[PDB]
Amino acid sequence: SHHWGYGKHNGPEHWHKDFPIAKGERQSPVDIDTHTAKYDPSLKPLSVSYDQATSLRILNNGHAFNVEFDDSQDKAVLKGGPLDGTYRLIQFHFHWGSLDGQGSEHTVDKKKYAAELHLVHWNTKYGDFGKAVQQPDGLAVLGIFLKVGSAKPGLQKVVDVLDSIKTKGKSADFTNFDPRGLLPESLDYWTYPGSLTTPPLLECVTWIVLKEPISVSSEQVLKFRKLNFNGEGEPEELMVDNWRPAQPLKNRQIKASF
Numbered sequence: 001s002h003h004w005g006y007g008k009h010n011g012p013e014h015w016h017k018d019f020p021i022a023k024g025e026r027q028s029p030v031d032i033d034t035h036t037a038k039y040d041p042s043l044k045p046l047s048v049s050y051d052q053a054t055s056l057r058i059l060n061n062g063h064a065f066n067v068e069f070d071d072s073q074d075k076a077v078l079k080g081g082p083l084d085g086t087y088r089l090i091q092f093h094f095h096w097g098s099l100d101g102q103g104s105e106h107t108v109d110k111k112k113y114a115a116e117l118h119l120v121h122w123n124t125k126y127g128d129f130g131k132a133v134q135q136p137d138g139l140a141v142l143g144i145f146l147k148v149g150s151a152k153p154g155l156q157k158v159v160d161v162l163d164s165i166k167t168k169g170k171s172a173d174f175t176n177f178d179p180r181g182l183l184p185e186s187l188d189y190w191t192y193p194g195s196l197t198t199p200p201l202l203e204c205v206t207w208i209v210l211k212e213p214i215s216v217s218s219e220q221v222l223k224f225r226k227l228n229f230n231g232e233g234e235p236e237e238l239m240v241d242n243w244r245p246a247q248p249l250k251n252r253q254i255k256a257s258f
């Protein structure tokens, strides 16, 4: 069978035929118009508590790679900001381009970054991820832009395992990785209600998008671009341009923490 992806024949313009929510009222990503976003003094301080994070594995899922965490206890959590309660880190992944001038999902005044990091968390009041994605406040995704410049030292362990997970369905052990090494200095952010940016495109996400990008080197992003969408032994389809473009804002407001 065919499957959704990022090519001409199965990319974002096709997703609505199997995932009609693709044309919904709270789809992600969106363009962040900085002049229209409003400071919200009701936002509480944002709390990223990752000191006890336990990474387990890295997986090439045929769309991106996921760095997976042990979420059987509150070992790595996001709280505060726009969030009510506690959200547990389950995985992170990236979206990136074929060229440095595109790759992000969110845009900032229509600016595209080279890539975007998504740290995915689920609301512990719903007990598991699968139940959380049946809820309008089930997930919180912390989004971080990547620009090309100086290397991000904390990213290099991710870059160096990618050769071992080149093709779809390959995984590798990935213990003792500290995701705090992927953050910028500032936690200043924009927030809005949205969706998963991949099928099934479920409208369950509180998005928290940091204003400050991280810098990664050209060499680091070049290694992202050597991954494959295809499986082993299949003709090579480089894993590039695995981003969804901006969707209509509709009846939403983006709030700023700053």
Ligand SMILES: NS(=O)(=O)N1CCCCC1
Pocket (backbone or CB within 6 Å): 002, 003, 004, 005, 009, 010, 011, 014, 015, 016, 017, 018, 019
């Ligand atoms: N609607 S979809 O899931 O993106 N896909 C399009 C290509 C054929 C298989 C279904």
Ligand SMILES: NS(=O)(=O)N1CCCCC1
Pocket (backbone or CB within 6 Å): 118, 120, 141, 195, 196, 197, 198
């Ligand atoms: N790209 S995303 O919206 O962060 N992600 C959340 C977890 C499920 C797959 C989609």
Ligand SMILES: [Hg+2]
Pocket (backbone or CB within 6 Å): 133, 134, 135, 136, 137, 138, 202, 203, 204, 205
């Ligand atoms: Hg939902």
Ligand SMILES: [Zn+2]
Pocket (backbone or CB within 6 Å): 093, 094, 095, 118, 197
């Ligand atoms: Zn994502």
